[PDB]
Design a protein around this ligand. Structure first.
Ligand SMILES: CCCCCCCC/C=C\CCCCCCCC(=O)O[C@H](COC(=O)CCCCCCCCCCCCCCC)COP(=O)(O)OC[C@@H](O)CO
Ligand SMILES: CCN(Cc1cccnc1)C(=O)CN(c1ccc(OC)nc1)S(=O)(=O)c1ccccc1C
Ligand SMILES: CCCCCCCCS[C@@H]1O[C@H](CO)[C@@H](O)[C@H](O)[C@H]1O
Ligand SMILES: CCCCCCCCS[C@@H]1O[C@H](CO)[C@@H](O)[C@H](O)[C@H]1O
Ligand SMILES: CCCCCCCCS[C@@H]1O[C@H](CO)[C@@H](O)[C@H](O)[C@H]1O
Ligand SMILES: CCCCCCCCS[C@@H]1O[C@H](CO)[C@@H](O)[C@H](O)[C@H]1O
Ligand SMILES: CCCCCCCCS[C@@H]1O[C@H](CO)[C@@H](O)[C@H](O)[C@H]1O
Ligand SMILES: CCCCCCCCS[C@@H]1O[C@H](CO)[C@@H](O)[C@H](O)[C@H]1O
Ligand SMILES: CCCCCCCCS[C@@H]1O[C@H](CO)[C@@H](O)[C@H](O)[C@H]1O
Ligand SMILES: CCCCCCCCS[C@@H]1O[C@H](CO)[C@@H](O)[C@H](O)[C@H]1O
Ligand SMILES: CCCCCCCCS[C@@H]1O[C@H](CO)[C@@H](O)[C@H](O)[C@H]1O
Ligand SMILES: CCCCCCCCS[C@@H]1O[C@H](CO)[C@@H](O)[C@H](O)[C@H]1O
Ligand SMILES: CCCCCCCCS[C@@H]1O[C@H](CO)[C@@H](O)[C@H](O)[C@H]1O
Ligand SMILES: CCCCCCCCS[C@@H]1O[C@H](CO)[C@@H](O)[C@H](O)[C@H]1O
Ligand code: NA
Length: 301
């Protein structure tokens, strides 16, 4: 099953790096692509490239070897970068939802500009980089057999170190709510209201307002799919983390094989999400589809 896992990780790594570079390039090279949503979708691609390039190979080696082969320093740095990336992704999706909700449901309160989106993007990185410092603090690299640590990294493990049994329960309950449940629950409600507004009863006297509304339905439909695919890809890892850290599950040696498989699939799924988003844009955005088609047909075959 290791060949199947390596191949799946290789496929995801290649599709994510190519797909996400194409998203960044399409927006950078084309003025018509520089919309508020597409600036945030570029930020999602930057967070997804950070995870794919630096964290995906380390995660594939842990899932294959059942050991940490990158030393003490990277045992703090790689978990930190993976968590920062999840925070940038979820906060980016939250700010898109917020932008679309105000623009469509409450149009005359806040100004939606590309320059304000760049300020929001910097804020997302500033917040994500700071709130994940406690995650890096608890990461520790230890050898299961101390007397062999000097000759091999085979029996070395990277894991969280907690001084008491209550602190990880409080921390991981907050982690789940902040990185998954509260932003996705709020986004679901925002998109339900956007759905009712865009697909609801047409108000008469609207100007050739008609074009923006048609364009908005296409974008909202795409964004709802991105949010639903994010919710599904991050559901196993989020649930497994809570059950392990808060409810003290998966500690029995008899279950080792079932637990290994479930956690390994949940780790791959996170990375599969970085590969999924450019594929979603290709099928649900004629603008991105046109750019990707140009990239594979004449920019470079
Ligand atoms: C750390 C977080 C950081 C992220 C922060 C950024 C997150 C920003 C994301 C999006 C911004 C947009 C938010 C807008 C949310 C809009 C919420 C909303 O209005 O829906 C309500 C449903 O409530 C309801 O009964 C349902 C009540 C909630 C159900 C409980 C599930 C909890 C999951 C989530 C809980 C989070 C709460 C956060 C607490 C501060 C009322 O609808 P209503 O009837 O008018 O009909 C709808 C339709 O028919 C209108 O045409
Ligand atoms: C507390 C963080 N967490 C929960 C979580 C909920 C939702 C989204 N991501 C992570 C974990 O499961 C723990 N971690 C994890 C493991 C593999 C992986 O593959 C996508 N993703 C995250 S970790 O601290 O970032 C870590 C730990 C040890 C080795 C490598 C890494 C990246
Ligand atoms: C630099 C080596 S990273 C390595 O590069 C491969 C490229 O093919 C990927 O497929 C793997 O997943 C990844 O670990
Ligand atoms: C091709 C690039 C893909 C890798 C993704 C990483 C993007 C860099 S985010 C960057 O992190 C810095 C931390 O020092 C902050 O100073 C910046 O304000 C913030 O914007
Ligand atoms: C920020 C820290 C980045 C500096 C590189 S640390 C260096 O990186 C190798 C990766 O291959 C490990 O194998 C080694 O053990 C380790 O010493
Ligand atoms: C200049 C001030 C303009 C801002 C005034 C806000 C008007 C409140 S509308 C209110 O908004 C909610 C969220 O969309 C819906 O759930 C409700 O059903 C709907 O009645
Ligand atoms: C819990 C929320 C944490 C996410 C951090 C982002 C905070 C918003 S930054 C702020 O956003 C404005 C528009 O939103 C821009 O006009 C500004 O120039 C910029 O500085
Ligand atoms: C922009 C904010 C940058 C700081 C993020 C830290 C990245 C992991 S390095 C690591 O951080 C730990 C505390 O988190 C400490 O135990 C170590 O001394 C230090 O080597
Ligand atoms: C580096 C060692 C790993 C972090 S242990 C961490 O240390 C804190 C201060 O001692 C306490 O607040 C927590 O309860 C405890 O989990
Ligand atoms: C807002 C954060 C809320 C986190 C929820 C923590 C619940 C974990 S189980 C709970 O933990 C206690 C301390 O270990 C024990 O006294 C109880 O017997 C046990 O049932
Ligand atoms: C704070 C974030 C992490 C915690 C989320 C898990 C909530 C579990 S509550 C759970 O609901 C069940 C429903 O059937 C009851 O049977 C149980 O008695 C009760 O334990
Ligand atoms: C959405 C992610 C949060 C998980 C919510 C599902 C409810 C958790 S069932 C959990 O099962 C354990 C083993 O029987 C017990 O220790 C706990 O009492 C019980 O609560
Ligand atoms: C979105 C998916 C959420 C799934 C949450 C899983 C929580 C189930 S834990 C555990 O499972 C056992 C099955 O045998 C039951 O006997 C126990 O009563 C229960 O505590
Ligand atoms: C904001 C508060 C959030 C509270 C969510 C905790 C749900 C309590 S279920 C209860 O407690 C422990 C897990 O918390 C488990 O060890 C037990 O098996 C289970 O029966
Ligand atoms: Na992602």
């Amino acid at each position: 099953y290791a060949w199947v896992l390596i191949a799946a990780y290789v496929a995801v790594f290649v599709v994510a790096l190519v797909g996400n570079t194409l998203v960044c390039l399409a927006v950078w090279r084309n003025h018509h692509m520089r919309t508020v949503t597409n600036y945030f979708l570029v930020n999602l691609s930057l967070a997804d490239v950070l995870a794919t390039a630096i964290c995906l190979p380390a995660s594939l080696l842990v899932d294959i070897t059942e050991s940490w082969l990158f030393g003490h320093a990277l045992c703090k740095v790689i978990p930190y970068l993976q968590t920062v990336s999840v925070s940038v992704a979820v906060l980016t999706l939250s700010f898109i939802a917020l932008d679309r909700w105000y623009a469509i449901c409450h149009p005359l309160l806040f100004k939606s500009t590309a320059r304000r989106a760049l300020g929001s993007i910097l804020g997302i990185w500033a917040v994500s980089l700071a709130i994940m410092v406690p995650q890096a603090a608890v990461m520790e690299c230890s050898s299961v057999l101390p007397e062999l640590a000097a000759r091999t990294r085979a029996f070395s493990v990277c894991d969280e170190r907690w001084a008491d049994d209550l602190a990880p329960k409080i921390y991981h309950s907050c982690f789940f709510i902040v990185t998954y449940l509260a932003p996705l629950g709020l986004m679901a409600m925002a998109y339900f209201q956007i759905f009712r507004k865009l697909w609801g009863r047409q108000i008469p006297g609207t100007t050739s307002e008609v074009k923006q509304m048609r364009a908005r339905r296409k974008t909202a439909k795409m964004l709802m799919v991105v949010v639903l695919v994010f919710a599904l890809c991050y559901l196993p890892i989020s649930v497994l983390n809570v059950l392990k850290r808060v409810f003290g599950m998966f500690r029995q040696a008899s279950d080792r094989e079932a637990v290994y498989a479930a956690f390994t699939f949940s780790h791959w799924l996170v990375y599969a999400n970085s590969a999924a988003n450019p594929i979603i844009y290709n099928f649900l955005s004629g603008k991105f589809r046109e750019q990707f088609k140009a990239a594979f047909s004449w920019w470079l075959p």
